[model samples]
Target chain A: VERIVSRDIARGYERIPIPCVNAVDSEPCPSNYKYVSQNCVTSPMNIDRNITHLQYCVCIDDCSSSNCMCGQLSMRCWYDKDGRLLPEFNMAEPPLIFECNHACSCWRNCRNRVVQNGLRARLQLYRTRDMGWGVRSLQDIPPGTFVCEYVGELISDSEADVREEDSYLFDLDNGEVYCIDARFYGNVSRFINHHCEPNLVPVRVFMAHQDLRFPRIAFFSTRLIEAGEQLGFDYGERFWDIKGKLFSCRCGSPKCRHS
Target chain B: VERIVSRDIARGYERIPIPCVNAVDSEPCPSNYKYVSQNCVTSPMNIDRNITHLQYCVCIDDCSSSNCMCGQLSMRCWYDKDGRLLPEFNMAEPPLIFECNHACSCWRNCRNRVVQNGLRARLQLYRTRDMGWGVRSLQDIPPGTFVCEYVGELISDSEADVREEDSYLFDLDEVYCIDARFYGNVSRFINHHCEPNLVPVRVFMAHQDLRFPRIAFFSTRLIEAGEQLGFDYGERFWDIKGKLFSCRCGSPKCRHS
Candidate 1:
């Protein structure tokens, strides 16, 4: 006789199972939230809802034999032979990473197919001693590895301003005023903490189509990381400046702005 | 033709080439040392170096059907179905993880074969801005994921004490020590940080057998991609040296302070 323990926090929404562990303390699962794989428009804004098909960027030779159309969209091939982002990547002005998506004719395993392949690293939902719910990796991650995409309900900046909750709010400044509210719906990225010296970097990725205004916010590793290390990203000066006094920053980095 | 820029500081020794990048500064690799994949005993001690064949630990059904003999050695299975160490792992008293070795009758893809399979993560030997040479993973590592084993010239405690260099010395306390000086692997380049990402664990494999437990590093937390890999060298390492060396780890809790 075997007793089965359901560890997958996503239940089944994620492509692979993300297990949750609580060895530090007895913490319950996050409340009043549902899991969603992609971003959905919750507000009645007249936003373009159609997925633009990149027919011109489709490659027949799988993007390796010659110059890939999708790779050209980004102006460079972002991934190496092993599908890892090239080591020479700079975070200050990080280049746009474009991947062959559902609209591409290339096979699923094409070199250009990175973020679209979904999460490859085994991540976990671990409860921290001080930080409530944090996301960590169960496998050693290399620089340029795609961790997860920041997904939630998309709403206009006007609606975001009217809302009082800034805990699960993520501002998107892609030449437009939009915000992602993960208060009700989110993926594993919602659980990641804020760190001054974070190993994760947010990059704008174009996968389903080449919409500069509405690009997918994907997080990638900035350096070599051992397994079990907490994954985090800088929430920027604006976020901390706004919520600085209200919430104490417990990121615990040497360069931490707040305690 | 595109100009090929060589970045792998390891050159060709590692299974997967570890690239080297110096955005911080143009620091050179640690001098006067040759690269090695495994540990070698430089001293002429009367050591029993013969690898023990674990015939008893061999499982015909790949250790899933019945109680595994190798797993039984550790009393319980340390790894989950995903081959990751169980979440209940206690680092202070870490369990001895025994893997299915070449001596076992299991297939190459057996769940019991973890560290024996070699390095899975894409690690890089990077040039730190101030800390000189350091090792960082290029991929996000999960907690309990096997990183790399500390390999060097296995020596006795008496021989380790005579050595003036404490930079590359690691004590096993199996009454023996490991000196990565002269001959070592990419792990030799891993620098020390106050807040380390790796945790050292004692493991007994087919090569080392049960007598001498090999020191293997595992990620203590969810390591993100590009984070430098570090481990506590322990207070004893510094205590024996009389005074503390200046630590530039940049952690909020620096011990040297």
Candidate 2:
């Protein structure tokens, strides 16, 4: 199964299978889009193999040692040496996240094994007024909490430019290598719209494959977020291109590109 | 709301829920994919009696009245003035099918109101093994029998290009199109075969908006019961969606092009 679902167990919004975020067909899944869980798929954006060659992180027994290749072995992208997740440093500079995965010798109980579980927070899918539907947290979220993974058909940047569906596209930022298409099959994170000042930010993450080529895309709370607050990201200025001209910005932020 | 869905009511391989044919999420569903059964849509790919249509027939009395535009009130698409559905002429040259829709005075009993209910034949989604999932008929399907209609996200041509998902897609002319990647009905299981038994035909109907014409597929030949259903999904499709699902159509004269 994809991310182990709890039904309408948490948030009021019943997460329907409509947006098949991590779900796969009954048959043996395609070779490229490897099915991770009921809600998690580790697909190559476009290329077949990971371009980066960072050797798999070899963790000692319980990863109780600092030599654990999974960075600080922290649950999140907290690179702090103490193995404790702190909010202040995360805001100054986004941290590099290396979560525990299949390659790791550590068990699932490892604090660093969070990303694989996918988004478990109580969330809702409701109308975001004119900006279309968006996702909101049912409970308050703290900084560095592994929010969700931006999973979809991994496509190349050139392919992305060719298709031109920039709305649902998220740049991989891995050397301008690839992007994700959350339009058809994605989790509630796909529903989150762009914001000028956002609470959650997308942090490049990695697990089994410690290469920029195969880094996992994760979202973390940069600050404490309110329960009903909407989750968004800064799509960045580069998004304003000849292709983006067809669409208008409704981000409603002061830095409003109503420019 | 979307179409009402019944369980493994008719065919086997209980149709899984995906993005629907002629349906979308952001915008309110277009007229055709409208949920006559409310938004809880679970429609059959073959037949639910004809599916939820935005417009119905308005035939006053015998539908013989010109206003009874439904070409008589038969459920299956009957444009023949004489009424009883003739399979011969229909297969020879596909007739200009104008079926009664929801706006019509005629109800589900209306003769022209086919599709609203769904596939008349017993169909099933069996494993083609090599080619993901496929649809087939349990009974011999006539030349003119309504097999299935290609449905999915009704996107514009520009939008389709922008999205890049061309597999399981059907065109409504060039301006608008359909891509069933996320949500879909059972028909999404129908695989692509070069020289196939089923044929895709775009037809018009009586409705509030006529932006996109209705798309339906009919059997090109008198297909035997166990014969698998196949349609040409265009050779061009071979290039784009990539060999990700390269031709597994398993046709003899397969245009392995």
Every model's DockQ: 0.01, 0.01
lDDT of candidate 2 over A108-201, digit per residue (tens): 4554555655566667555544765667777888766766677655666777777745666777775568677655444456667877677777
- In candidate 1, what are the lDDT values of residues B41-151, reduced to their tens digit? 554434332323343455657576447877876666677777678888886678777776544545556667677666667987766778777888888999988898887
Interface RMSD for each predicted structure: 28.3, 20.7
The TM-score that candidate 2 achieves is: 0.40
Q: How displaced is residue A45 in candidate 1, in Å? A: 5.5
lDDT of model 2, residue A216 = 64
- Evaluate residue A125 in candidate 1 and report its C-alpha lDDT on the 0 to 100 scale: 83
What DockQ class does candidate 1 belong to? incorrect
- Residue ranges of candidate 2 with Cα displaced over 4 Å: A1-65, A72-84, A242-248, A255-259, B1-257
